[PDB]
Amino acid sequence: RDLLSKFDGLIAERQKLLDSGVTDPFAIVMEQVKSPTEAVIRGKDTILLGTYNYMGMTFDPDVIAAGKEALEKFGSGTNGSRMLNGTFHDHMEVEQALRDFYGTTGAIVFSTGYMANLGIISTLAGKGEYVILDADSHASIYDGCQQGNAEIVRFRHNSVEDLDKRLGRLPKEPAKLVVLEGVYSMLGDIAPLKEMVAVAKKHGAMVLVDEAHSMGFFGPNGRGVYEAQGLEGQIDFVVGTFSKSVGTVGGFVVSNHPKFEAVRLACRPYIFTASLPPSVVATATTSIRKLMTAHEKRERLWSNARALHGGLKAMGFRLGTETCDSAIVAVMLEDQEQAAMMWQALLDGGLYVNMARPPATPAGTFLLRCSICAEHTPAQIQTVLGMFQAAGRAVGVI
Amino acid sequence: RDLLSKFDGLIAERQKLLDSGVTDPFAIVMEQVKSPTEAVIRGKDTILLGTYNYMGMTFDPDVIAAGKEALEKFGSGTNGSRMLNGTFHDHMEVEQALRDFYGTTGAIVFSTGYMANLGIISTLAGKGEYVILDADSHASIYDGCQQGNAEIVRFRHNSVEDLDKRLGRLPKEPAKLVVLEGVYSMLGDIAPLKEMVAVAKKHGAMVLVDEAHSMGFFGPNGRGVYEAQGLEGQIDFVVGTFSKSVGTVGGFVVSNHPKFEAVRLACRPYIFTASLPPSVVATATTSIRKLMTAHEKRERLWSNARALHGGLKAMGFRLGTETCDSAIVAVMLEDQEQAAMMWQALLDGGLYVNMARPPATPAGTFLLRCSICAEHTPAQIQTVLGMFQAAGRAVGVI
Ligand SMILES: *Cc1c(COP(=O)(O)O)cnc(C)c1O
Ligand SMILES: *Cc1c(COP(=O)(O)O)cnc(C)c1O
Ligand SMILES: [Mg+2]
Ligand SMILES: [Mg+2]
């Protein structure tokens, strides 16, 4: 036995899944990517319906030109931390783009969204302070809690009442951070932010909202669910990512707090890593700025989501949401076998969606998660619906 | 008081430093970067001597062409995890390049080196197991320990004897991970890996060596200090980064362990983040492959390092090492004021080096850290030495 013996269970489980004849869902390779909505997988032209490229920015010609120009002018990397030699022209640009996008005075970019959550949670809340979060929060949020020294207070998923009761039992004096997500990504439902933020404020907590799954398409300025729910000016910190709507890699936190940017002086995941490559921050800058006014894309995204959500439900699929509330549409299946058969039939027929099974989801929950793109055409969405009808029948969903 | 009140001390300290008239060392912006060794800072042409671009790969024409081609062909980002939709052609390529570079069957790429350390340490060693590390290990290694549930065992810095004594007192049965760095980056000295690995093996521990500061220029194949010290085939895991010699962003761990790649199934910082952009993994692939045989660069790097190290010592600077053992040359100054005055005079004269003061360094240690590049010319190195002589005099080092 050695350090890897602990993986024997996971290795056996994987082999059991493969024994069913299914393609390994954790080893899919996009051999070619023709556009935000088309790839070649296993030598087959395939519609993409399992990416977080919500606004189709990855092939935007301005984004691509900015990336190429940055490679040419500044090279492939920075070879240093933001606190030393790794802040180039384009890093300053991308932080200003976030200030402009969110209407904040402060903006701190990290090398990943995971690291932004890890860092901001573990740095803001110290010993004797409290981080209060939804039971089903993103892994990076839990990892930020684990990385820090604060008291961690979970509340029942999606429960305004349990948030209120749990907050109310904490001592009044210590500072507190309530961490919320605008969109619950598993099912694509929306958090009751207006009510939860009111509860947080009643108890004197600061609020951090993750708006990774809403950027560019919720609220008048595309700032997120909090903006859509009228909370502009009430959110202490907003965390996000460059890997979804923005279409690259990176993380950020924005704020209007006067001391915010002193976080750079303390935050270990900000300090102890190289800054992002020039091309990454140049593509992010361009993309963020375009997202401020990408009205045609926003309209298409929501039109597509409504057509997919409406079509799957009408067919008889059980969805994670009664109404189309986000760009994630989750199809709920009865068991692991049904989900795998559906996923495989879709893939073989030319469609890629994400499958989620335990322990990614709770025991008893087996999903196909579809994520819509501004650049899907109405034709593609109908093709997808046809594919879902054909697979749902061969498998016997529906 | 709120969550940011804890930063009042750091804010006051920063203001005290600025009160001396020094440029803020934590807010330097590379406005233009002409080459690996030249930038424009504060409107002034400046020689770069504080980057980890050891092999000058960031402006390599093959690296740049690969990045541009990847933007064009695959877009700006992947919008998904490696376990879902984020593995493109170029991700498979970069992991194969690492296998070829290190002669291993296993290779796992992460979105940063920080995350590779965070993830591999917290995933390999669980409850009831031990992570044994040097007191002065990199922050990411300590953060990996904090993220995991293992027992953490620090040993006195650079002490083979204390490693042996501390290891020997642990229970025999539980699995153990000894984590070592090939190059101690603060001063640029080298770990006694041959002796430490022998000690680790005597006690039945697995060994993880970080070779971030040696890639491409230690050992016959450029694999690192462990290779230079004859330890090929004896190291269980080697961790590294794409941000130094490789010249982009990203992290990795390589191994020949038969179960290694099952780490993908468990490792939270691998699973819960987007994969790197196509351009990043394409530039990394190209760079890694060129590093396998970059003999001219290697020779220049070491020639430059020897000239800088030899020249600074002869001038009368106290260096962190008696002999030129790495591409980091650390100048030790008597106090914080001396270091800041030296740093400012160098900057104003057209040279950028890194300054390190407490709490980055231990109390009593005040450094200028020079990092050499394969692409520095002998002329630049003499210019640098002239600048060090001029500043050392105006300040009164030397
Ligand atoms: C996607 C996501 C992250 C991680 O972002 P990456 O940039 O991919 O590391 C963090 N939090 C939430 C809620 C996310 O959805
Ligand atoms: C630079 C470094 C890291 C971090 O690498 P990044 O890729 O910049 O996140 C981790 N460990 C060591 C020893 C390092 O030197
Ligand atoms: Mg094309
Ligand atoms: Mg140029």
From Swiss-Prot, chains A, B:
Query: What's the record's pH-dependence note?
Result: Optimum pH is 7.5 to 8.0.
What is the top-level taxon of the source organism? Bacteria
In this chain, pyridoxal 5'-phosphate is annotated as bound at 113-114, 213, 241, 243
Swiss-Prot/TrEMBL keywords: Acyltransferase, Cytoplasm, Lipid metabolism, Pyridoxal phosphate, Transferase
Q: Which residues carry this modification: N6-(pyridoxal phosphate)lysine?
A: 244
Q: Which Pfam families match?
A: Aminotran_1_2
Name where it mostly resides. Answer: cytoplasm
Cofactors, names only: pyridoxal 5'-phosphate
Reported EC number(s) for this entry are 2.3.1.50
Cysteine pairs forming cystine bridges in this chain are none
Q: Where in the cell is it found?
A: Cytoplasm
* BP GO terms, sorted: biosynthetic process; sphingolipid metabolic process
Annotated GO MF terms: acyltransferase activity; pyridoxal phosphate binding
Q: In which pathway does it act?
A: Lipid metabolism; sphingolipid metabolism
> By its UniProt entry, which NCBIfam families does this protein fall under?
SerpalmtaseAlphaP, SerpalmtaseBetaP
Q: Which family does it belong to?
A: Belongs to the class-II pyridoxal-phosphate-dependent aminotransferase family.
Please give the subunit comment from the record. Homodimer.
Extract the PANTHER family matched here.
Answer: CLASS II AMINOTRANSFERASE/8-AMINO-7-OXONONANOATE SYNTHASE, LD36009P
Q: What does this protein do?
A: Catalyzes the condensation of L-serine with palmitoyl-CoA (hexadecanoyl-CoA) to produce 3-oxosphinganine. Exhibits a broad substrate specificity concerning the chain length and the degree of unsaturation of acyl-CoA.
Please state what the protein is called: Serine palmitoyltransferase
Gene encoding the protein: spt
